[PDB]
Amino acid sequence: GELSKDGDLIVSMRILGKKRTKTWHKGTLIAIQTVGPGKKYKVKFDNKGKSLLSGNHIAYDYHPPADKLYVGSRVVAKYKQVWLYAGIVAETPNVKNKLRFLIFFDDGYASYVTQSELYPICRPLKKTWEDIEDISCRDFIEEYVTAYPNRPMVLLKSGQLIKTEAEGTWWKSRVEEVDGSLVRILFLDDKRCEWIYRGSTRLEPMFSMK
């Protein structure tokens, strides 16, 4: 069941492939084979190694034309060390976010990225969250994508003090910066910062609103 092509996936093309580290790397598509219920894509990485990957574990080595992607799109994006990591498009370019894509990564991390920092996954699952390993992440994305565009958020201002959840504990914290749908939270006991989605119930006011 060997193939030279599969629609726009052609043997010899440049490609990104997911390694066991969960990070994504440049390589070449060297074979396509039907194994059991679907296709496997054999990738030879530029730096080191080969892998046989499912079509949701390869990505195109080009950036999307902006309006190709939408909320729920499965992508690889620059995670700012710096790595390429898998995620979901949570918000597309607009004036409020300065024309950036909001990415919710597979591990729960969130950040805004530019059009030249993301790569569409070749064959995502129809329900795009179903290949997210971490179950709390998987569930969150299903809920978020399905509820879109209904996004309850809290209005927060720089200098405002709130409790923010992390690791089972609610911590004294401070709002350092607002950036579109993200808020930069300073945890006051240990002095670390985290960018958090303004609709996340890890923010006390958002938790308390529901």
């Binding site: 919710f104 990564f105 591990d107 729960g108 991390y109 969130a110 971490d134 709390s136 992440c137 969150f140 978020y144 959840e165 992390a166 690791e167 089972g168 670390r192 985290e194 958090i196 989605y197 996340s200 119930t201 890890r202 938790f207």
Partner: peptide
């Protein structure tokens, strides 16, 4: 990595 994810732990 240091992420706390999108929802409280669980």
């Amino acid at each position: 990595k240091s992420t706390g994810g999108k929802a409280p732990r669980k």
